[PDB]
Amino acid sequence: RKTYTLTDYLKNTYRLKLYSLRWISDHEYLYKQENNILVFNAEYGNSSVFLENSTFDEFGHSINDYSISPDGQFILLEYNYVKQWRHSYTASYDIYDLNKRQLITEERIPNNTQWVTWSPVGHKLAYVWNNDIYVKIEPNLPSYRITWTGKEDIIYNGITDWVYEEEVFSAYSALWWSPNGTFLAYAQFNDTEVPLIEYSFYSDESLQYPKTVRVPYPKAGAVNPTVKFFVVNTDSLSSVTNATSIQITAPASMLIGDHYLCDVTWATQERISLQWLRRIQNYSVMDICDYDESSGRWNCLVARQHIEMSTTGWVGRFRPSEPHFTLDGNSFYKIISNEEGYRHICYFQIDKKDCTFITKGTWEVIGIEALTSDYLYYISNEYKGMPGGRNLYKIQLSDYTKVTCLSCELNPERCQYYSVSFSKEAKYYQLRCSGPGLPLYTLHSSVNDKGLRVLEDNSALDKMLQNVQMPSKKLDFIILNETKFWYQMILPPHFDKSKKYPLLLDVYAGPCSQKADTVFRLNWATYLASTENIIVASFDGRGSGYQGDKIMHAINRRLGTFEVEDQIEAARQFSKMGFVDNKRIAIWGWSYGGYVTSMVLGSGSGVFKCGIAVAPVSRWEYYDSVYTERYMGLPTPEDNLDHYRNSTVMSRAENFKQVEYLLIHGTADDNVHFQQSAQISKALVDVGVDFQAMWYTDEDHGIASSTAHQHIYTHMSHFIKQCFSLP
Amino acid sequence: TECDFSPMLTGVAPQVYNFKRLVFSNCNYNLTKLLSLFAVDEFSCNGISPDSIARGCYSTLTVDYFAYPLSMKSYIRPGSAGNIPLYNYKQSFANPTCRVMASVLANVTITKPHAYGYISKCSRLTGANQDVETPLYINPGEYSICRDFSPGGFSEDGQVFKRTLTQFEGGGLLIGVGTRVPMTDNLQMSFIISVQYGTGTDSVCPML
Numbered sequence: 004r005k006t007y008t009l010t011d012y013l014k015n016t017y018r019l020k021l022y023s024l025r026w027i028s029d030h031e032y033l034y035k036q037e038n039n040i041l042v043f044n045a046e047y048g049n050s051s052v053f054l055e056n057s058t059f060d061e062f063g064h065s066i067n068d069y070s071i072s073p074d075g076q077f078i079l080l081e082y083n084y085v086k087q088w089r090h091s092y093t094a095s096y097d098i099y100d101l102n103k104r105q106l107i108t109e110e111r112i113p114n115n116t117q118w119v120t121w122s123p124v125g126h127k128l129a130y131v132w133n134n135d136i137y138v139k140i141e142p143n144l145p146s147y148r149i150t151w152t153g154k155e156d157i158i159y160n161g162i163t164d165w166v167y168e169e170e171v172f173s174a175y176s177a178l179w180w181s182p183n184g185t186f187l188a189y190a191q192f193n194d195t196e197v198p199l200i201e202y203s204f205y206s207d208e209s210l211q212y213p214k215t216v217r218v219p220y221p222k223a224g225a226v227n228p229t230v231k232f233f234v235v236n237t238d239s240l241s242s243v244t245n246a247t248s249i250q251i252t253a254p255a256s257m258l259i260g261d262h263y264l265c266d267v268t269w270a271t272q273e274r275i276s277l278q279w280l281r282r283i284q285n286y287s288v289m290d291i292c293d294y295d296e297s298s299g300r301w302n303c304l305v306a307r308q309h310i311e312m313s314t315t316g317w318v319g320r321f322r323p324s325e326p327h328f329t330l331d332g333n334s335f336y337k338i339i340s341n342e343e344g345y346r347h348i349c350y351f352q353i354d355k356k357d358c359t360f361i362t363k364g365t366w367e368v369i370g371i372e373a374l375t376s377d378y379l380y381y382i383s384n385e386y387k388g389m390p391g392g393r394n395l396y397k398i399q400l401s402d403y404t405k406v407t408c409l410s411c412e413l414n415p416e417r418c419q420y421y422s423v424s425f426s427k428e429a430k431y432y433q434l435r436c437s438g439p440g441l442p443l444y445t446l447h448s449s450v451n452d453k454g455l456r457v458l459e460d461n462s463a464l465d466k467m468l469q470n471v472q473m474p475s476k477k478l479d480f481i482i483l484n485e486t487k488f489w490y491q492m493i494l495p496p497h498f499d500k501s502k503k504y505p506l507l508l509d510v511y512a513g514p515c516s517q518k519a520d521t522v523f524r525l526n527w528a529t530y531l532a533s534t535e536n537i538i539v540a541s542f543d544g545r546g547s548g549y550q551g552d553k554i555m556h557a558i559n560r561r562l563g564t565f566e567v568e569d570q571i572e573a574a575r576q577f578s579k580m581g582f583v584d585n586k587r588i589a590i591w592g593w594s595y596g597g598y599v600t601s602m603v604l605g606s607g608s609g610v611f612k613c614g615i616a617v618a619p620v621s622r623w624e625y626y627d628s629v630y631t632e633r634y635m636g637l638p639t640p641e642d643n644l645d646h647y648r649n650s651t652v653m654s655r656a657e658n659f660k661q662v663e664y665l666l667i668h669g670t671a672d673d674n675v676h677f678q679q680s681a682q683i684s685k686a687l688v689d690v691g692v693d694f695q696a697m698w699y700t701d702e703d704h705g706i707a708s709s710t711a712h713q714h715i716y717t718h719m720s721h722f723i724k725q726c727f728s729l730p
Numbered sequence: 731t732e733c734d735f736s737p738m739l740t741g742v743a744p745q746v747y748n749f750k751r752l753v754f755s756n757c758n759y760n761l762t763k764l765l766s767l768f769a770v771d772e773f774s775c776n777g778i779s780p781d782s783i784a785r786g787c788y789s790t791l792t793v794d795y796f797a798y799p800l801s802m803k804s805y806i807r808p809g810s811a812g813n814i815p816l817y818n819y820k821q822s823f824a825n826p827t828c829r830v831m832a833s834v835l836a837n838v839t840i841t842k843p844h845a846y847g848y849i850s851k852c853s854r855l856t857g858a859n860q861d862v863e864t865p866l867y868i869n870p871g872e873y874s875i876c877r878d879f880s881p882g883g884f885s886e887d888g889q890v891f892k893r894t895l896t897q898f899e900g901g902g903l904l905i906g907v908g909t910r911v912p913m914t915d916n917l918q919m920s921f922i923i924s925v926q927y928g929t930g931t932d933s934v935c936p937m938l
């Protein structure tokens with residue numbers, strides 16, 4: 004039969020099918036079938052055409068995306084999309100009436116809009132343009148200007164600056180509508196004293212002089228952005244006087260120094276929760292704020308404060324978890340770490356300090372998915388004690404001993420990794436299985452957990468793949484000091500454990516990472532195992548997540564140590580297994596994986612022949628403050644400068660004489676700056692080490708443009724094949 | 731001799747939390763005259779009528795005055811509290827009072843402040859993790875402990891202030907926030923008039 008080739012991977016010849024739906028009510032959802040927008044009925048499965056695909060091929064532009072108002076009356080049309088960072092972009096927008104079937108032409112959302120969002124009910128619009136917030140009560144009426152302080156690279160209203168987009172909210176948007184759309188809450192970010200990273204962008208051949216890109220970007224220990232939080236009443240807006248925003252100040256425990264706004268969650272129509280986080284991120288507070296028309300302010304009662312801090316590391320996995328409020332808003336459920344260091348659901352009263360865990364065990368809750376008056380729905384890795392598994396559970400609120408697994412036994416062979424999408428009021432839910440078999444999408448009704456139908460079973464792909472010698476995947480664990488540590492291996496087809504195979508260690512290994520799971524993937528490793536008979540292993544050592552704080556917080560204040568050592572040790576045990584050629588063990592990684600790869604290669608352990616680092620961190624003082632300081636604290640003599648200096652890649656330059664190294668970086672990387680690899684090469688040059696290198700002009704951290712993506716994997720494949728003496 | 735309501739219209743109008751007070755004794759006043767310089771929006775009295783206030787004989791006539799936007803009219807009213815009566819100015823009702831909400835007229839010649847400003851946070855901080863927060867509130871007629879931070883106003887909306895409290899003041903940290911309300915076309919003010927009826931020989935009657 005055939006094998007899964009590099010061309011198959013680069014040309015996407017074996018496609019995974021998806022089933023992306025948008026719930027619009029408690030029983031209906033939108034879905035795109037052959038470019039039409041269809042509205043489906045959850046209970047019956049019938050569908051009408053919501054929007055005929057021919058509706059806008061007379062529009063004059065290409066639609067990048069669309070957004071339908073909650074009441075169904077209007078569709079927001081996105082075109083002229085221009086990507087900025089990981090989540091940010093600008094676009095032109097047209098609104099289109101769905102009963103009159105006509106394009107609104109008056110009082111239009113301007114070109115180069117930074118963000119747009121419908122109110123959660125009805126059809127109000129809030130958008131951000133030139134760093135200021137505007138509100139349209141009706142699609143054809145004029146806009147009310149909420150903010151006037153907006154200013155490029157300095158003041159951000161309703162949108163995030165670079166570091167808040169990347170490391171805090173994972174979003175460009177900093178707008179939070181109240182549940183019924185009365186209030187619009189928004190953050191204001193201030194980058195006034197934040198230093199700028201600068202780098203060249205070469206652009207098209209026709210550009211004579213390169214551009215210099217300048218982004219406000221706080222590297223470790225540098226001056227951070229500041230933040231203020233506001234709420235505006237969108238129902239009492241005046242076309243004659245300037246809008247009034249009420250400021251919700253951070254609690255005084257935060258104002259004494261540097262801090263972040265790290266969570267925003269509306270509790271009720273007149274109650275908002277905010278979570279703040281000190282710049283030393285082992286201390287956070289939640290504030291609960293009620294609207295008070297009488298006194299014209301948002302009162303945040305001190306007695307309603309909830310302090311969350313950590314004694315072994317930082318708070319949350321990457322940030323304090325979001326609360327899920329009961330309907331009346333007087334109590335809420337929140338994932339927090341227990342006394343054993345495991346993360347479970349805790350039950351809070353808004354005015355009571357102590358909380359009550361409703362789950363426990365040596366496993367973890369991944370996320371709270373839905374809340375009804377009777378049941379709390381969550382995802383966890385409890386099943387068979389596999390940290391790399393995900394299942395849907397519901398727990399009865401009247402009796403915490405009644406826990407039901409809703410996904411475990413549906414198809415235990417094919418499906419061990421689940422996510423879920425609930426309808427409104429959680430009357431229906433879609434289940435999405437990602438492995439270890441081909442992905443499978445089903446729909447269920449909540450009232451009696453009945454399976455209604457299969458939405459997508461990837462049977463097309465299944466038929467295609469049987470003519471192909473596909474690799475298999477082994478998920479298991481080894482033991483280090485009476486502790487289970489999980490690994491996975493992508494094994495070549497017809498795997499003969501009496502043969503010796505070369506091994507490529509696929510590493511990431513950042514804090515709370517997980518590279519050993521049950522997820523089905525069709526990627527580069529698939530080609531390496533299927534065509535080149537390479538074993539591709541990954542290993543979750545110390546610092547990895549979803550296994551309790553004792554593992555995760557192990558690398559606290561000491562990045563570049565245990566997580567690095569544990570990758571070397573795992574490779575040693577792999578080479579002892581008998582089917583691994585120990586003269587041909589390589590290692591490769593991206594971003595944090597690039598750092599670990601490099602640190603491993605420079606350790607002089609002798610275990611690895613060659614390695615590839617793509618866009619690596621090389622020195623933690625080079626990386627942004629929020630991510631870095633979360634794990635390392637501040638780079639000062641009073642804090643943690645010693646570990647900052649001892650954990651660079653440049654420090655280990657001498658040891659690279661023992662290995663073949665390939666260093667790759669995009670020149671337009673706004674995330675892990677080219678500087679980082681630039682310093683690695685300089686240190687290797689200064690010490691006489693030969694190595695391979697590759698820059699990618701105007702590529703960012705993803706190196707994901709069509710041509711660049713194909714080029715780097717083609718290049719890396721040559722490198723691996725040559726290193727492994729494959730012809 | 732005549733009552734001198736001059737100082738409350740010369741110089742720069744003080745902010746609400748930094749109110750200035752004129753106390754008159756043995757002095758004859760024209761209230762109608764003083765009120766003529768303003769466009770009055772609210773005239774709420776307590777323990778006395780807006781007619782009697784301009785015609786009565788008093789032992790003392792006290793006026794607290796400050797800049798204040800009329801958009802915040804409702805937030806300085808009794809019992810409805812309130813960033814203003816908590817941290818800035820709390821009206822006393824121990825004596826007959828009158829609260830006047832007014833805009834100064836166009837060709838009066840006042841030099842107004844850059845903006846209106848009030849304190850919207852004032853707390854003491856103690857504890858090992860610096861997190862026992864105790865909001866500090868004023869008694870009527872007294873100045874906030876957070877007033878000294880920036881008596882002239884706030885150049886920034888949501889401006890933060892920090893200070894160590896002396897052993898005497900109770901120790902710990904003092905935290906204050908001030909908010910900024912943009913200045914209006916015509917200066918908007920507020921003055922609180924208070925009278926007493928003392929037995930002593932000396933009065934403040936109106937002018938004949």
Ligand SMILES: *[C@@H]1O[C@H](CO)[C@@H](O[C@@H]2O[C@H](CO)[C@@H](O[C@@H]3O[C@H](CO)[C@@H](O)[C@H](O)[C@@H]3O)[C@H](O)[C@H]2NC(C)=O)[C@H](O)[C@H]1NC(C)=O
Pocket residue numbers: 152158193194195196229885886889
């Ligand atoms: C965004 O943050 C910047 C940087 O923190 C803010 O700029 C600063 O605002 C202060 C106001 O507190 C300016 O003032 C100084 O205050 C002291 C008196 O306490 C005095 O010594 C100085 O004469 C001056 O008045 C400061 O110059 C200014 N710094 C700048 C502009 O670089 C800015 O206010 C913030 N903007 C927003 C919208 O939050």
Ligand SMILES: *[C@@H]1O[C@H](CO)[C@@H](O[C@@H]2O[C@H](CO)[C@@H](O)[C@H](O)[C@H]2NC(C)=O)[C@H](O)[C@H]1NC(C)=O
Pocket residue numbers: 042043044047049050051
């Ligand atoms: C799905 O089917 C239901 C019927 O099973 C549709 O509801 C009916 O629609 C017809 C025609 O519009 C009406 O005359 C009936 O009165 C409706 N009956 C009920 C019980 O609703 C429904 O509109 C369909 N939905 C979609 C999205 O196709």
Ligand SMILES: *[C@@H]1O[C@H](CO)[C@@H](O[C@@H]2O[C@H](CO)[C@@H](O)[C@H](O)[C@H]2NC(C)=O)[C@H](O)[C@H]1NC(C)=O
Pocket residue numbers: 151243244245912
């Ligand atoms: C709403 O606020 C804006 C911004 O403060 C006002 O516009 C400014 O007015 C000042 C007055 O000197 C000018 O210097 C600025 O150039 C104006 N524009 C901007 C963008 O700041 C506006 O007048 C206010 N509107 C109302 C109705 O009061």
Ligand SMILES: *[C@@H]1O[C@H](CO)[C@@H](O[C@@H]2O[C@H](CO)[C@@H](O)[C@H](O)[C@H]2NC(C)=O)[C@H](O)[C@H]1NC(C)=O
Pocket residue numbers: 283285286312313314636641642859
């Ligand atoms: C958050 O972490 C910091 C840094 O580890 C803690 O501050 C240090 O605590 C140790 C022992 O508690 C002291 O010996 C150091 O002097 C402290 N400062 C530094 C710079 O290390 C802090 O205690 C932690 N906060 C909480 C609430 O646990």
Ligand SMILES: *[C@@H]1O[C@H](CO)[C@@H](O)[C@H](O)[C@H]1NC(C)=O
Pocket residue numbers: 037038039056057
């Ligand atoms: C529009 O939908 C019809 C439905 O049959 C389909 O045949 C056609 O190819 C679609 N057009 C585009 C451009 O997707």
Ligand SMILES: *[C@@H]1O[C@H](CO)[C@@H](O)[C@H](O)[C@H]1NC(C)=O
Pocket residue numbers: 095111112113114
């Ligand atoms: C966006 O730009 C185009 C081209 O300059 C222009 O024709 C169009 O009117 C603009 N749209 C708006 C809403 O200003």
Ligand SMILES: *[C@@H]1O[C@H](CO)[C@@H](O)[C@H](O)[C@H]1NC(C)=O
Pocket residue numbers: 183184185272273
């Ligand atoms: C939305 O909630 C606010 C605050 O409780 C309330 O005043 C308003 O009437 C509500 N509007 C609707 C349409 O329910």
